């Protein structure tokens, strides 16, 4: 058959120059790869900086706890109440280790639950981690690493100067219970000899630590509880300050934004999974060609226009927002390639200014509706962002219900809310819009509209119809023009937003059973034959493949399956037929749909119900 279907081995090495940046140069020098690398590195550095600014307070508390233990038997321990998303947490501990290597306050060993199956392996991993941590800051065997060697090493090194011995346990729930209890007893027995600090990584609650630590074990424990900020709070902070930040030209659409937030809030609280899904979305957007490399600031996009080729204009011609720009004006647009080359920077500055005014109008309207009760549009910026990019926001009945509830209030609360909206929008314009390039025209366009709103507030505070005038003016100069949908968007807005959701939905969320169910119900969806078509999903025509017929034939039967009537009904549908049926029951057992029971002479049981 094949070279790799050997009956003896299972693994095959194709070493070509291995000893003790995957793509070529022709793809890297393309401008979309450089633009995607710059944008992804910017977004990843911003998310890392936000996570550092979130974690730094609890990091300082833990460092002060270790130092205050050093300035000082039971051992001092510190349960760190992290979230359920474990792969987000260990990097946090690494940051703590770096700070504990800054002040020379301790040296840190990390005990994973995979290394601590027994007490011997846990003690050996602990001593080896501490000794190699000292060796790496400034080799013993596996069976040589003992607590007596740790005591001798600590006497030889750090008795003359004290360094704490911080023991970090990142996955407290996944430990063997008896190994963890005996490790706490071992560490508490050596108090006074070796200064031990025990940092825990409890993910669920303090009830877990109180349950898995018995009476005699918790008699030697002086724990102090720390709290980390929650994963929905970190998600909302990342969404407020990065994904809605105006200084990135790459926008998401409403459906992809809702898809990624649904993946976070409904399935798994993993910030890293959100980051990798957003990275895949940014990669799938920018990997459409050099035409999508114009999605940056103004000067770099103008340069990329000046270096652009012919096929990039040919693929910005095909995008659906380009054609109503043509129909609204013709003989030079569609083929001549230079009329569009001189017409593009106006469209680029139009889309950039439209998205900047969209963010500012979104800030204004979320301050206006955010303190309102009953929240018909949502509380934060993100739900209003989805509802304002999805559809016509004024044609939606939720905005009319919002207007009915804003009319049901007094004049004092309305005046206070619109003054708060004016002050917040001016603060957002002076802080975050002002350093941004092509931001001067943004303020110079949106600010006289705000002067109109503020003068309407001035006439309603000087004198019920002026409240309605303020509401309709807020509608007319903020909600109508600067808060469009994605269908009422400007021309050629595809380069900047990303609406391709079915391909990303297939390639991020994995549905093996849907594809198996479709390929076993109608193979015509995959084979695309002119003969295997089915009107309904149970016709069972004769030109079907073999495994589809056997799956349909066992699907209608009961729990227990006989070989005889199933083989006879297969002969009724479709020698070598026995070899084909043996091949079919082997392939259908291989997928996990049925199972041949052990010494049930021919009867096989279906595991799917």
């Amino acid at each position: 058959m094949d070279p790799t279907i050997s009956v003896s081995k299972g693994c095959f090495v194709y070493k070509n120059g291995a000893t003790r940046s995957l793509l070529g140069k022709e793809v890297v020098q393309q401008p979309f790869y450089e633009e995607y690398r710059k944008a992804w590195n910017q977004i990843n550095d911003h998310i890392a900086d936000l996570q550092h600014r979130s974690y730094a307070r609890t990091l300082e508390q833990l460092v002060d706890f270790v130092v205050g233990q050093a300035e000082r038997e039971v051992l001092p321990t510190a349960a760190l109440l992290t979230g359920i998303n474990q792969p987000d947490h260990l990097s946090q501990f690494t940051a703590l280790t770096q700070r504990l290597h800054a002040q020379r306050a301790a040296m840190v060993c990390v005990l994973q639950s995979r290394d601590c199956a027994t007490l011997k392996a846990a003690v050996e991993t602990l001593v080896f981690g501490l000794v190699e941590d000292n060796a790496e800051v400034e080799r013993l065997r596996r069976s040589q690493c003992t607590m007596k060697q740790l005591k001798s090493w600590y006497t030889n090194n750090f008795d003359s100067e004290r360094r704490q011995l911080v023991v970090i346990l990142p996955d407290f729930e996944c430990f063997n219970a008896s190994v963890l209890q005996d490790l706490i007893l071992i560490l508490s027995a050596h108090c006074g000899s070796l200064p031990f600090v025990l940092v825990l990584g409890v993910a669920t609650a303090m009830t877990a630590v109180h349950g898995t630590l018995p009476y005699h074990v918790s008699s030697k424990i002086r724990l102090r509880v720390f709290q980390t900020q929650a994963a929905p709070t970190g998600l909302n902070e990342v969404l407020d300050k990065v994904l809605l930040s105006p200084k990135y030209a790459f926008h998401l659409s409403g459906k992809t934004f809702k898809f990624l937030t649904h993946i976070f809030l409904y399935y798994d609280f993993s910030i890293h999974g959100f980051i990798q899904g957003f990275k895949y979305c940014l990669m799938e957007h920018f990997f459409g060609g050099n035409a999508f490399a114009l999605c940056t600031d103004y000067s770099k996009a103008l340069g990329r226009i000046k270096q652009l080729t012919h096929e990039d204009m040919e693929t910005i011609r095909r995008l659906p927002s380009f054609r109503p720009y043509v129909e609204q004006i013709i003989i030079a647009v569609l083929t001549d390639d230079d009329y569009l080359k001189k017409k593009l920077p106006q469209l680029l500055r139009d889309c950039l200014l439209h998205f900047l005014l969209f963010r500012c109008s979104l800030e204004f309207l979320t301050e206006l509706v955010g303190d309102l009760p009953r929240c018909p549009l949502g509380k934060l910026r993100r739900e209003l962002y989805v509802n304002c990019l999805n559809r016509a926001i004024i044609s939606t009945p939720e905005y009319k219900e919002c207007l009915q509830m804003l009319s049901f209030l007094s004049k004092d609360e309305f005046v206070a809310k619109v003054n708060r909206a004016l002050e917040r929008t001016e603060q957002f314009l002076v802080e975050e819009i002002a350093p941004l390039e092509l931001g001067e025209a943004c303020t110079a366009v949106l600010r006289p509209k705000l002067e109109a709103i503020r003068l309407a507030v001035d006439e309603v505070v000087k004198a019920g119809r002026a409240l309605q005038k303020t509401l309709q003016l807020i509608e007319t100069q903020i909600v109508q023009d600067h808060l469009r949908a994605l269908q009422d968007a400007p021309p050629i807005h595809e380069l900047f937003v990303f609406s391709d959701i079915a391909t990303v939905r297939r390639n991020i969320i994995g549905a093996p059973r849907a594809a198996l169910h479709t390929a076993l119900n109608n193979p015509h969806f995959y084979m695309q034959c002119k003969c295997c078509e089915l009107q309904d999903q149970s016709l069972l025509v004769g030109t079907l493949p073999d495994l589809s017929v056997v799956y349909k034939l066992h699907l209608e039967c009961g729990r227990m399956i006989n070989l005889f009537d199933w083989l006879q009904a297969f002969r009724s549908v479709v020698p070598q037929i026995q070899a084909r049926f043996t091949r079919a029951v082997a392939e259908l057992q291989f997928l996990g749909y049925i199972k041949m029971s052990k010494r049930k002479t021919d009867h096989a049981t279906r595991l799917t119900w």
Partner: peptide, 17 residues
């Protein structure tokens, strides 16, 4: 519709102006 037939019809009607 196809971009080819739409571009062809728009160019032909642009010659029909």
């Amino acid at each position: 519709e196809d971009y080819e037939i739409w571009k062809a019809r728009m160019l032909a009607k642009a010659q029909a102006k």
